[PDB]
Amino acid sequence: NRPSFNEAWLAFRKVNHSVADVGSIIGGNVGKNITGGYFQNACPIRMSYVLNATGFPIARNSPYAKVSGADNKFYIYRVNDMIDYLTHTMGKPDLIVNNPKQSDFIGKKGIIVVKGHGWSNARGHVTLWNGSICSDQCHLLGPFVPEVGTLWILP
Amino acid sequence: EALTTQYSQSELLKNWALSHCLALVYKDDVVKNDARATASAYLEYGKQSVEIYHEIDEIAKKYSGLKYNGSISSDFNTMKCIDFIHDRELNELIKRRVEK
């Protein structure tokens, strides 16, 4: 099934910090790659932490690039991989919206994926959504232009 | 708005090598962070496992550790990166990558 919304939001707050701090928190190969500067975008790593912390851990054999943490659990480090992973483990989203905006996602909570143009380091972002804001950053719904917004509701 | 999505896997790996080396040789925090961010962009669109970037770093470390001199005052760090991206082993490493 799916992680509870409350647990997800709690977990995410634990890693809602600078990528360096995320490195200190998770440790192991995650921390090591962050220390070395190889990982700068904490987004998929934060989401990985969420899944691993709420009873829906990423399998060692999921066909996505993973790195272990000190907990010996696994952390995806590419946004595109994280998005595909959700698409393939959670199934099909509860809501899909072209040219998404905040009002489109009102009154619903869970995992949100926004793809669009204008970023030089990624095709989009994946984070938590509580009905009015994102868990990290934040008022995504300005250089980034969202083309597609996708939500998996968390119970 | 950058050309990040237009590079081939091979080009991404070369762009990564360059940016990463620049992150290694420069002292200033803002610049170093900038080069790191840039590198991370190229890693995002890669299909390769993280170890290949570690290996690229090994090779880069062979250049960033060099002492360069001239008849003008400089450490010539920039050119260490430029010589590095011409490295034959770097190129062979990228060409024989398992994850194409």
TrEMBL record, chain A:
Disulfide bonds join C134-C138. InterPro entries: Tae4 (IPR025562). Pfam families: Tae4. This is Cytoplasmic protein. It comes from Salmonella typhimurium (strain LT2 / SGSC1412 / ATCC 700720). The lineage of its organism: Bacteria, Pseudomonadati, Pseudomonadota, Gammaproteobacteria, Enterobacterales.
Automatic annotation (TrEMBL), chain B:
It comes from the Bacteria. It comes from Salmonella typhimurium (strain LT2 / SGSC1412 / ATCC 700720). The chain holds residues 28 to 127 of 127 of the full protein. Disulfide bonds join C21-C81. This is Periplasmic protein.
